[PDB]
């Protein structure tokens, strides 16, 4: 299904969405994406909205 990452960063704000099978596979993608974009922060996951947040 569609998973969302809400980015509340020092440089980048925004929202990315991907298609993934599981919240676990979505997390691996999103950690790779945060890595790639120099984002290091506090994370949550909300199952109702299928949404991770990372906040710097």
PDB file of C-alpha atoms in Angstrom, residues 1-54:
ATOM      1  CA  UNK A   1       0.000   0.000   0.000  1.00  0.00           C
ATOM      2  CA  UNK A   2       1.087   3.672  -0.001  1.00  0.00           C
ATOM      3  CA  UNK A   3       3.392   4.787   2.880  1.00  0.00           C
ATOM      4  CA  UNK A   4       4.165   8.411   3.643  1.00  0.00           C
ATOM      5  CA  UNK A   5       7.139  10.164   5.197  1.00  0.00           C
ATOM      6  CA  UNK A   6       6.516  13.562   6.720  1.00  0.00           C
ATOM      7  CA  UNK A   7       9.884  15.383   6.853  1.00  0.00           C
ATOM      8  CA  UNK A   8      10.207  18.227   9.351  1.00  0.00           C
ATOM      9  CA  UNK A   9      13.870  18.950   8.805  1.00  0.00           C
ATOM     10  CA  UNK A  10      16.235  21.803   9.399  1.00  0.00           C
ATOM     11  CA  UNK A  11      16.554  22.344   5.609  1.00  0.00           C
ATOM     12  CA  UNK A  12      13.811  20.251   3.947  1.00  0.00           C
ATOM     13  CA  UNK A  13      10.146  20.179   4.872  1.00  0.00           C
ATOM     14  CA  UNK A  14       7.711  18.045   2.960  1.00  0.00           C
ATOM     15  CA  UNK A  15       6.132  14.712   2.428  1.00  0.00           C
ATOM     16  CA  UNK A  16       7.237  11.777   0.303  1.00  0.00           C
ATOM     17  CA  UNK A  17       5.067   8.747  -0.613  1.00  0.00           C
ATOM     18  CA  UNK A  18       6.133   5.322  -1.835  1.00  0.00           C
ATOM     19  CA  UNK A  19       4.462   2.016  -2.534  1.00  0.00           C
ATOM     20  CA  UNK A  20       5.644  -0.773  -0.268  1.00  0.00           C
ATOM     21  CA  UNK A  21       4.174  -4.106   0.900  1.00  0.00           C
ATOM     22  CA  UNK A  22       4.783  -3.592   4.624  1.00  0.00           C
ATOM     23  CA  UNK A  23       5.547  -0.734   7.092  1.00  0.00           C
ATOM     24  CA  UNK A  24       8.868  -2.581   7.683  1.00  0.00           C
ATOM     25  CA  UNK A  25       9.936  -2.366   4.019  1.00  0.00           C
ATOM     26  CA  UNK A  26       8.713   1.299   3.947  1.00  0.00           C
ATOM     27  CA  UNK A  27      10.931   2.002   7.004  1.00  0.00           C
ATOM     28  CA  UNK A  28      14.043   0.580   5.293  1.00  0.00           C
ATOM     29  CA  UNK A  29      13.373   2.817   2.231  1.00  0.00           C
ATOM     30  CA  UNK A  30      12.747   5.848   4.413  1.00  0.00           C
ATOM     31  CA  UNK A  31      15.904   5.333   6.511  1.00  0.00           C
ATOM     32  CA  UNK A  32      17.886   5.027   3.271  1.00  0.00           C
ATOM     33  CA  UNK A  33      16.179   8.228   1.986  1.00  0.00           C
ATOM     34  CA  UNK A  34      16.898  10.118   5.293  1.00  0.00           C
ATOM     35  CA  UNK A  35      20.578   8.933   5.067  1.00  0.00           C
ATOM     36  CA  UNK A  36      20.801  10.100   1.429  1.00  0.00           C
ATOM     37  CA  UNK A  37      19.406  13.490   2.267  1.00  0.00           C
ATOM     38  CA  UNK A  38      21.336  14.104   5.440  1.00  0.00           C
ATOM     39  CA  UNK A  39      18.259  13.988   7.684  1.00  0.00           C
ATOM     40  CA  UNK A  40      18.941  12.820  11.310  1.00  0.00           C
ATOM     41  CA  UNK A  41      16.074  13.155  13.840  1.00  0.00           C
ATOM     42  CA  UNK A  42      13.225  11.764  15.976  1.00  0.00           C
ATOM     43  CA  UNK A  43      10.908   9.252  14.296  1.00  0.00           C
ATOM     44  CA  UNK A  44       7.323   8.148  14.752  1.00  0.00           C
ATOM     45  CA  UNK A  45       5.007   5.809  12.849  1.00  0.00           C
ATOM     46  CA  UNK A  46       1.159   6.104  12.779  1.00  0.00           C
ATOM     47  CA  UNK A  47      -0.557   2.989  11.448  1.00  0.00           C
ATOM     48  CA  UNK A  48      -3.980   4.727  10.675  1.00  0.00           C
ATOM     49  CA  UNK A  49      -2.430   7.129   8.225  1.00  0.00           C
ATOM     50  CA  UNK A  50       0.436   4.721   7.199  1.00  0.00           C
ATOM     51  CA  UNK A  51       2.760   7.586   7.942  1.00  0.00           C
ATOM     52  CA  UNK A  52       6.265   7.948   9.356  1.00  0.00           C
ATOM     53  CA  UNK A  53       7.498  11.277  10.581  1.00  0.00           C
ATOM     54  CA  UNK A  54      11.135  12.382  10.941  1.00  0.00           C
TER      55      UNK A  54
END
